[PDB]
């Protein structure tokens with residue numbers, strides 16, 4: 001498909017699947033700072049899936065690359081905050097990341113192909 005706009009609904013459908021995953025529950029809303037009082041001593045830029053969905057729905061992503069950078073920050077934040085590579089929440093993040101990467105690969109490829117077709121002449 002050479003549709004330059006198709007990534008947006010493809011990303012909405014993938015966020016729907018991520019919200020149905022039990023593994024997403026820790027990442028649906030901002031990290032609770034009363035629960036984890038040192039969180040902002042370790043994490044400079046908090047990110048969560050509700051924030052990513054709102055950003056997309058506001059029309060404040062220009063490309064699926066930008067959405068992909070914010071989703072990858074959800075996962076790098078969990079790796080940076082975990083006290084162990086065996087923690088429950090970190091382990092959930094690694095399964096959810098594998099799922100996300102499996103699904104976003106075609107979204108990115110199709111978008112970049114569409115942009116190349118737009119500039120072909």
Ligand SMILES: COc1ccc(NC(=O)N2CCN(C(=O)c3ccc(C)o3)CC2)cc1
Pocket residue numbers: 025026027029030031032035036077078079081082083087089090093
């Ligand atoms: C109000 O409802 C909420 C329910 C759950 C959450 N999630 C959190 O508080 N988080 C804890 C720290 N995070 C980690 O990635 C993490 C790696 C290791 C360990 C122990 O935590 C992110 C997720 C936020 C709001």
